[PDB]
């Protein structure tokens, strides 16, 4: 873990639902902007990585791919740890891409890496949130404020142990992501949402 490793996720409260019928139930435009900005913000000439499971890669519309200005890592158990002509890292485990990045001195095409973001897959989230190299969680806490009868029926969840983590102050979130970040509850449609940061509670 030379660069710091964040698990970045938007989770419905209180049970941390992250998906429904194979996709994301809410469209929150500013949450999107936050995701883009945080995962993209690096020192001049540096870059961040975004690590995702194959199904999340397939959910991303093709006009976004690879996610611009970031090192794309796709995890598939059939991958052969190859980098393609677009620069995308097709690796078979998080452990194997961490070893490869390390022997590269945590550089991508001569660009130092600043942060490594785990952006996706329930499967990937729930494996890696148990990897001790994960240094923090960037959790957008999403709240449904519409009518009970129209609440999303979440079917996939972040199985995270609250007790193993400690929420940090908003100032610490902003210091880490390198950006001013809206504080408190953001509103869009039937949803309220708040940006939060958590570190290990050892
Ligand atoms: N709310 C949020 O912030 C986010 C929500 N989501 C939601 O998550 C859901 C999709 O997540 P999920 O369906 O779990 O798909 P994932 O994106 O986690 O990718 C799953 C794939 O990852 C690969 N994989 C699984 N375990 C391993 C392993 N141990 N080593 C290497 N590769 C592995 C497999 O590909 P193979 O079979 O080829 O090995 C598997 O099919 C959707 O509902 C989406 O909306 C997604 C991202 C963020
Ligand atoms: C912008 C939504 C979003 N917000 C946050 N805070 N984290 C994420 N990991 C994502 C995300 C969701 C679905 C996909 Cl397919 C990719 C990324």
How many other C-beta atoms are found inside a 10 Å radius of the C-beta of residue 162?
A: 10
Say if CB 41 and CB 110 are below 8 A apart: no
Say if CB 140 and CB 194 are below 8 A apart: yes
**Domain that includes residue 176, residue range:** 4-200
Q: Report the C-alpha gap between 156 and 110 in whole angstroms.
A: 38
- Beta-strand runs (E) in 93-149: 107-108, 111-120, 136-144
Q: First-to-last CA distance in the chain?
A: 17
DSSP class of 86: T
Q: Is 167 flagged in the annotation as binding?
A: no
Q: Report the C-alpha gap between 148 and 144 in whole angstroms.
A: 9
In the reported structure, the alpha carbon of residue 188 is separated from the centroid of ligand 1 by a whole-number distance in angstroms of 26
Q: Is 153 flagged in the annotation as binding?
A: no
In the reported structure, the alpha carbon of residue 119 is separated from the centroid of ligand 2 by a whole-number distance in angstroms of 6
Q: Is 8 in the pocket of ligand 2 (CB under 6 A)?
A: yes
Q: Report the C-alpha gap between 73 and 128 in whole angstroms.
A: 14
β-pair type (156-157, 136-144) = unpaired
- Find all residues with CB under 8 Å of 71, minimum gap 6, and list them: 47, 48, 49, 50, 87, 89, 108, 113
Domains: count for the chain: 1
Residue 131 maps to which CATH number?
Answer: 3.40.430.10
In the reported structure, the alpha carbon of residue 9 is separated from the centroid of ligand 2 by a whole-number distance in angstroms of 6
β-pair type (70-75, 47-53) = parallel
Q: Is 47 flagged in the annotation as binding?
A: no
Q: Is 119 in the pocket of ligand 2 (CB under 6 A)?
A: yes
Q: Which residues pair with 106 in a beta bridge?
A: none
How many other C-beta atoms are found inside a 10 Å radius of the C-beta of residue 194?
A: 16
Counting beta carbons within 10 angstroms of the beta carbon of residue 142, is it exposed (0 to 12), middle (13 to 18) or buried (19 or more)?
buried
Q: Report the C-alpha gap between 129 and 73 in whole angstroms.
A: 17
Residues touching ligand 1 (Cβ under 6 Å) are 9-10, 18-19, 22-24, 52-56, 59, 75-78, 92-93, 120-124, 127, 156
Q: What determination technique applies here?
A: X-ray
Q: Which ligand is nearest to the CA of 21?
A: 1
Provide the token pair at 33. Answer: 């902007």
Q: Is 76 flagged in the annotation as binding?
A: yes
- This structure's resolution (Å) is 1.7
Q: Which residue minimizes the CA distance to atom 1 of ligand 2? A: 32
Provide the residue count of the chain.
202
Atom of ligand 2 nearest to the CA of 38: 6
Q: Which ligand is nearest to the CA of 39?
A: 2
How many other C-beta atoms are found inside a 10 Å radius of the C-beta of residue 185?
A: 12
Counting beta carbons within 10 angstroms of the beta carbon of residue 14, is it exposed (0 to 12), middle (13 to 18) or buried (19 or more)?
exposed
Atom of ligand 2 nearest to the CA of 56: 15
Q: How far is CA 102 from CA 4, 90, 95, in A?
A: 13, 16, 11
β-pair type (4-12, 136-144) = parallel
Q: What are phi and psi of 19, to 5 degrees?
A: -160, 160
């Amino acid at each position: 873990t030379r660069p710091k490793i964040s698990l970045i996720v938007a989770a419905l409260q209180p049970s941390m639902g992250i998906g429904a019928k194979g996709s994301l139930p809410w469209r929150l435009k500013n949450e999107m902007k936050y995701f883009k900005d945080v995962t993209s913000k690096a020192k001049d000439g540096h870059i961040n990585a975004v690590v995702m499971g194959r199904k999340t890669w397939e959910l991303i519309p093709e006009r976004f791919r690879p996610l611009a200005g970031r090192l794309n890592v796709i995890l598939s158990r059939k991958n052969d740890d190859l980098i393609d002509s677009n620069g995308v890292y097709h690796f078979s485990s998080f452990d194997s891409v961490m070893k490869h990045l390390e022997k590269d001195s945590f550089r991508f095409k001569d660009m130092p890496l600043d942060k490594i973001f785990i952006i996706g897959g329930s499967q990937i989230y729930n494996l890696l949130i148990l990897d001790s190299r994960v240094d923090n969680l960037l959790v957008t806490q999403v709240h449904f404020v519409g009518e009970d009868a129209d609440k999303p029926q979440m079917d996939t969840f972040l199985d995270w142990d609250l007790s193993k983590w400690k929420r940090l102050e908003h100032d610490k979130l902003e210091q880490y992501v390198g950006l001013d970040v809206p504080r408190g509850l953001n509103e869009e449609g039937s949803y309220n949402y708040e940006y939060t940061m958590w570190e290990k509670a050892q």
